Ligand binder design. Structure first.
Ligand SMILES: COC[C@H](C)NC(=O)c1c(C)[nH]c(/C=C2\C(=O)N=C3CC=C(C(=O)N[C@H](C)c4ccccc4)C=C32)c1C
Length: 503
């Protein structure tokens, strides 16, 4: 599905064009060689040329496989890594680990294997690579290639860059298009916000707050921002596409009025991880309802509609009686000062609704005014049925604690205190975050689950920042554009674009 001339668009620039990039990019190990997807691949490719560095990459890979193995197979896996990497005369022996550190972990196998056993060793490895190996890579041709990729990442994005297919949902104050990148063939979802509506409504600050919150969070369970451009009539937001429906449709139309507890377990586990990634940026969501939980092609879920999200400054509280009738925590209803607690109250509502088939404070077959449902959220205690195990009852009651100070997860521990609840006793988060627990429902691919000033010029420049670094690099990799274009010379020789003699 790539454009006819895609190899011309993503054609590498001559390395001489990247001198300004070379002079300004910060040379941080974690960023260049790990966080940035393409940088990490280029650094690992550099270690393949050095015979002595190959073993360190293979070792860290095998440790990544160990962390995720299930407990009934860590003994044999822990042994396999020992006799291949940590024995003295091994085929691929690691030396910078230290004979004292291997002798310390060698006898740590004698005890109940830990999922994070090799954390000490792996960190000692990163210690070594941060030093000489990293500074050599900086003076290698692979880093010159990295600069070429950054030069492309930085190119301007416009209406031409994309290709709008038929609608993909709609909104009153903002359309939702399809937008596909012509050059790579990658699908997205556009959140077109026209300028005329926002200008007169005076919400420019709330459209920026949403764009920036989406830009900073990078989670497997929240919709990610990939591009932000302005067109001749609107400001656009290119986000992750979900073609699997929303959780409300699957609770009430697809499944019984509700789900099996084990199936609600899976979705709650992913939502919790989604909320945890937002809380790392000390950003609160406050819009947690079944409709905003979306399923993708594979069956996993992401949180959507961050328009009511707000980034709390560390150590401070905010006020705001916002949200949706029936999913607002008591501290929000009372217009008090709150932090992240509204999001754990929401999680309680979602787990309950998934298991029971109705809201904890409103019956599915009940007609109640918006004044009584609120009184219930503030006064009455919810009730449970035989659909809930004792574990399920517990976590819901603790999350639905009226007093936000005794509410589960609203302590100094954070989301960790929630992953520890007996409700998730049979859940292995390491494997869930690695994405190798099969979802309980897989959507069929063929399914369909449904005028100018100057003060605006400065606001538009702050919004239309262009492509987002990590999502863009991931796109290049997924579409195999990196595999095809990332071509060096025969027998480790400098290609033309990387030779400063003849441009
Ligand atoms: C293929 O059949 C499945 C059925 C027919 N369609 C869907 O499930 C299906 C499709 C195609 N797009 C979406 C929708 C999305 C998506 O995908 N990603 C995202 C990321 C972020 C939002 C988001 O913030 N919105 C808020 C409310 C908003 C506010 C104001 C204006 C516009 C939008 C929405 C989406 C959905 C569910």
């Amino acid at each position: 599905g790539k454009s006819k001339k895609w190899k011309e668009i993503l054609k590498f620039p001559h390395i001489s064009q990247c001198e300004d990039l070379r002079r300004t990019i910060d040379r941080d190990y974690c960023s260049l060689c790990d966080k940035q997807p393409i940088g990490r691949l280029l650094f690992r490719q550099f270690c393949e040329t050095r015979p002595g560095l190959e073993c360190y990459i293979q070792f860290l890979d095998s440790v990544a496989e160990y962390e995720v193995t299930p407990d009934e197979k860590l003994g044999e896996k822990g042994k396999e890594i020992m006799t291949k990497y940590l024995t003295p005369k091994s085929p691929v022996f690691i030396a910078q680990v230290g004979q004292d550190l291997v002798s310390q972990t060698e006898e740590k196998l004698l005890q109940k294997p830990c999922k994070e056993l090799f954390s000490a060793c792996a960190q000692s490895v990163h210690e070594y690579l941060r030093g000489e190996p990293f500074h050599e890579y900086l003076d290698s041709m692979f880093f010159d290639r990295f600069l070429q990729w950054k030069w492309l990442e930085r190119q301007p994005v416009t209406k031409n860059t994309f290709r709008q297919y038929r609608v993909l949902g709609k909104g009153g104050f903002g359309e939702v298009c399809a937008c596909q990148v012509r050059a790579t063939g990658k699908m997205y979802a556009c959140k077109r916000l026209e300028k005329k509506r926002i200008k007169k409504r005076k919400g420019e600050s709330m459209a920026l707050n949403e764009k920036q919150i989406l830009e900073k969070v990078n989670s497997q369970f929240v919709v990610n921002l990939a591009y932000a451009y302005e067109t001749k009539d609107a400001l656009c937001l290119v986000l992750t596409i979900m073609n699997g429906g929303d959780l409300k449709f699957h609770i009430y139309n697809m499944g019984n009025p509700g789900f099996e507890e084990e199936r609600a377990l899976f979705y709650a586990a992913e939502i919790l991880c989604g909320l945890e990634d937002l809380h790392r940026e000390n950003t609160v969501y406050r819009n947690l309802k079944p409709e905003n939980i979306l399923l993708d092609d594979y069956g996993h879920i992401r949180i959507s509609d961050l328009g009511l999200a707000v980034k709390i400054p560390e150590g401070d509280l905010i006020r705001g009686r916002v949200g949706t009738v029936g999913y607002m925590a008591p501290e929000v209803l009372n217009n008090q000062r709150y932090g992240l607690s509204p999001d754990y109250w929401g999680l309680g509502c979602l787990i309950y609704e998934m298991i029971e088939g109705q809201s904890p404070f409103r019956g599915r077959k009940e007609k109640v005014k918006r004044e009584e449902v609120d009184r219930r959220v503030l006064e009455t205690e919810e009730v449970y049925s035989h659909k809930f195990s004792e574990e399920a009852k517990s976590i819901c009651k603790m999350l639905l604690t009226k007093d936000a100070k005794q509410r589960l997860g609203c302590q100094e521990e954070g989301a960790a205190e929630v992953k520890r609840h007996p409700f998730f006793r049979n859940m292995n988060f390491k494997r869930l975050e690695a994405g190798m627990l099969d979802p309980p429902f897989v959507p069929d691919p063929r399914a369909v689950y449904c005028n100018l000033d100057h003060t605006d010029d400065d606001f538009y420049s702050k919004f239309s920042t262009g492509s987002v670094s990590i999502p863009w690099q991931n796109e290049m990799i997924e579409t195999e554009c990196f595999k095809e274009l990332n071509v060096f010379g025969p027998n480790g020789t400098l290609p033309p674009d990387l030779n400063r003699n003849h441009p």
